[PDB]
Symmetry: D2
């Protein structure tokens, strides 16, 4: 099929990219970065996140592959030594696909702007104090005040959700996880403290109380939104599709990254 390859930009990733292109030149494979069918990321998870968001509008027609030229990643989880065997098996095709859930973020102004996240989306305050009303399925749940909130995808739970105390969820679970950032709790102010895991079709809505300006991040893109009326989180109907050529369990990927490898 059609294919393209992104690279971290350093010398190791660029040269491995040119070697896979040359290996792809030995099959009916056409290099195309406009409407590709196979996107190969060479670098870390950050390079993979850039590859995802570069083609987020054709997710249902693309199978992603991750090659880590540095330490093992959760999305770039194949060694550079396996590039040649990767080229052939991708060349024949007939591979199976695995799908991970995505997080849809909707931001309303006083105008709507939606986003898709592979890791997570965070809300923080532009300078001053951060206070939100957290509304779950139109039911007011709590008035949060602290440094911010993080809504994570299943595969994003090992990223930044994890540093905030959140649990690690297997990516086959269609859900999203919300974690707190330095919440203040006293007799007057009250948050749940525990992380929350929401299923599909559950809508978590963040609504402002005083300041209406928020620093909103979606994966690695962070933009200050002004005059914000609402932030809506829910598990997306779209999914990201990986091409699998070997067996690499998520919990094994967790073991190698955090226990020892």
């Amino acid at each position: 099929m059609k294919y393209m390859i992104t690279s971290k930009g350093d010398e190791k990733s660029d040269l491995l990219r040119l070697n896979m292109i040359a290996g792809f030149g030995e099959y009916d494979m056409e290099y195309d970065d406009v409407e590709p069918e196979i996107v190969i990321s060479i670098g870390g998870d950050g390079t993979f996140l850039s590859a995802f968001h570069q083609y987020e509008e054709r997710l249902d027609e693309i199978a992603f592959i991750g090659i880590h030229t540095g330490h093992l990643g959760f999305y770039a989880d194949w060694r550079p030594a396996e590039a040649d065997k990767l080229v052939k098996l991708l060349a024949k095709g007939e591979y199976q696909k695995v799908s991970y859930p995505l997080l849809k973020t909707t931001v309303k102004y006083g105008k709507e702007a939606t986003y898709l996240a592979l890791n997570e989306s965070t809300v923080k305050s532009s300078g001053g104090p951060f206070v939100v009303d957290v509304v779950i399925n139109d039911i007011h749940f709590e008035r949060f005040r602290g440094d911010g909130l993080c809504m994570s995808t299943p595969s994003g739970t090992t990223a930044y959700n994890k540093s905030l105390g959140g649990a690690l969820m297997h990516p086959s679970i269609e859900a999203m996880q919300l974690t707190e950032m330095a919440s203040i709790n006293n007799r007057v102010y009250r948050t749940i403290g525990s992380p929350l895991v929401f299923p599909k079709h559950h809508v978590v809505s963040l609504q402002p109380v005083n300041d209406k300006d928020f620093q909103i991040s979606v994966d690695h893109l962070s933009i200050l939104h002004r005059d914000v009326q609402e932030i809506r989180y829910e598990v997306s109907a779209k999914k990201i599709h990986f091409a699998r050529f070997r067996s690499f369990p998520f919990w094994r990927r967790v073991h190698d990254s955090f226990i020892e490898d």
Copy 2:
């Protein structure tokens, strides 16, 4: 249908039980605690847990109801003032049922003994140090050492999973959650630290390293097992069925219990 009622034993729960029986006497309802179809628990979640385990072998033929004579519970979530309206609506029938997942615990000796848990099951050490090899889907994940482990159901996440830092999961998610109890982490000893959420059909196996005696709890029953070879956790194929007569969202039940009511 046939029905029975358990009571916490105090005077308030016993008298409310006799008043519901008298109200049930005004319909074709037969009191039977051998093969009931409706089990009504009057008390707290502890009384409800006793009611569940009393009829754990007929779970697919029973719809449970919880009435809290004290503070609001997550299973006993209906006020005593709503007992009369409860008797009639249960009398007519035609109610809908909601189902929560359960945790199957398997304990092997050198002999097998399986259990069902509505909240969680915990493993701790009989006196000395607690060390386990944690095996996920036959893959060795970590060597845990500390005070113990807790494997929680979705509706058990607000119980004791919560005190151990675990996340709160909506009970519609067929999953189980594992939390650590005072794990020691240094250069020599390494645990994941984060809680783990496992989907259906995933098998978490605990295996001993030195001591083979463990204090194993399943909800509120705690028994010391000797000569233990393995402890297997997985989401059960059985589910507990509640009869619902009103709308009481889980997140609303979480709000009232931990934020304010």
Copy 3:
């Protein structure tokens, strides 16, 4: 002696201020906000922090007083109903003084700029990733990467140190506490995780690795410092002096603020 009074600015605090001035007019008390001897803060802890930093260069010649027109504060810990009894006892004098330790922050450029903090001082990253080398008494302790670090005074432990998992220290302990903000820990990256409590004369030094621009906060003043070479934390030789007219134990102040009042 000479005295001045700051006010939160709202109508309740301004009018209580004019009533204490009128009550002070009935004694030999001279209102002076240039070289006062008694600084009375009317408002919350935020108003008290502004009062502290307004007179941080004459700390050894001032006894502070806090009056909370809203909820109880840890520095503004006297009810407005006790203002009249406060005016007289401050008028006679002969009060005893209590002293809390302070945190000295030193920031070096490529030039030095020192600060004093009553609550804490935090280091965060200007936009991009936050990586630091943490050096304790010239010994390299760890390479921190995450959202930031917080170095807290004893009386600042109930503030923002507390939201970050830190312990609450009695203000008689001459020490400082360091807490982490969303540290990432894997096989490759390693932080201590636990909060650290340092005694007097111990010097904690933060040193950059890549980015040399940091958002540095000292209590409520937050300023982006550019071209930063080092950030040095240590317990200050200066102390803040409170005038005490009653008995209000710190742990009682903790109980009323976080347990119930």
Copy 4:
């Protein structure tokens, strides 16, 4: 002076002990385990804790030494390769001494029994639910309910206090730290959550509410006390004295044990 040596019991520690005795035979050094002046522990921190409690009644006349035949310990912090240089420098004497604070535990019945702890002392429940009234300096602070409480010494903060979220305190700080074990917090039950650091002369008192039987641990000795009326914690007036022959900072000892060595 007089000296004795304890050993972990394995072959490596026993033979290193006989080699130090033979090396001590080359000086005026008399082996005496009744009234020694130098206690040398060969093993881990556990062997050192046994050595401490073996001579807890002559602490002001003993300087302890720790040799780790396994991984580095916080009390056994000298390599076996440094045993010969250790024998000579201990033989000459003229060494300096460092002192760490200790925790005094007082247990009253309905009779008093006091203990000394080098790491910590914990209170847990004999089977059933664990509820305590926590009283600080005769002021009731909170009603704790959960799995237990841990009161730690400064040098015990890296032990088991650390697994419970507590902070690490430099051992020059005369203080004690209290951490919670799986506390339950809802609208009805309320604990501080944060760890508490108490100075000298502060008295933390645990008092029962229903069950009067508690599993009380002091370092590695754990005994079930029946008919308990009170448990009193406070920094002891006694201190443990180490002989120092090199420079080994506590924070360096923390770095090697938890970061990397």
